[PDB]
Structure 1
Amino acid sequence: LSNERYQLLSQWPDFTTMYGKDFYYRAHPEDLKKFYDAADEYYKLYETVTEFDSLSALASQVVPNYAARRRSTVHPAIGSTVADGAFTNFLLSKQ
């Protein structure tokens, strides 16, 4: 999933081609501060999508809630479609 987000930071326009002083001084002083904030934002997004040593601890936030649903008192592989299909056998037979 991090690869699908890294692929859209791959398609980010090269803002460093507009760092020259012929773009600094032709531009509105507030549209240049927005441009320098949008360049500081890409480095925030890119330095956290390449923090791949953080994915191994995000996987441990998914494991314990999944593993408790598998500790079912009925069966590990039980679900609603089977347990509804086995209520049809239980209800539509005699008592």
Structure 2
Amino acid sequence: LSNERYQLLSQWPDFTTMYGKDFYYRAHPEDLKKFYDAADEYYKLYETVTEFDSLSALASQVVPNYAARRRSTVHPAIGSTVADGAFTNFLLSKQ
């Protein structure tokens, strides 16, 4: 999934082609501060999508709730559809 986010950070337009002083002084001061904020934001997003040592601790938050859902009093592989079919077999047979 981080690969699919990094693929759309690979499609980001190059803002370091507009770092010269030709684009500094032709441009509105507020739009230039916005452009520099947009470059700072891309550096934040790219520093945090390539922190791959954090995925191994992100995966430990999906693990306990899933393992407690499998630690069932009926069956590890039970679900709603099998329980519904067994409820018809229990209900539509006699008593």
TM above 0.5: yes
User: What SS does the aligned partner of 2:53 have?
Assistant: helix
Deviation at 1:2, TM superposition (A): 0.0
Mark the runs of 5 or more structure 1 residues left unpaired by the alignment.
none
User: What SS does the aligned partner of 1:72 have?
Assistant: coil
* Root mean square deviation of aligned Cα: 0.2
Deviation at 1:60, TM superposition (A): 0.1
Deviation at 1:68, TM superposition (A): 0.1
User: What SS does the aligned partner of 1:53 have?
Assistant: coil
Deviation at 1:50, TM superposition (A): 0.2
The total of aligned residue pairs comes to 95
TM-score (normalised: structure 2): 1.00
Mark the runs of 5 or more structure 2 residues left unpaired by the alignment.
none
Deviations 1:37-56 (A, max 9, x none): 00000000000000000000
Deviations 1:13-70 (A, max 9, x none): 0000000000000000000000000000000000000000000000000000000000
With a CA cutoff of 8 Å and minimum separation of 6, indicate the structure with the bigger relative contact order. Answer: 2
Distance 2:56 2:4 in 1: 17
Distance 1:70 1:20 in 2: 59
Structure 1 runs of 4+ aligned residues shifted over 6 Å read none
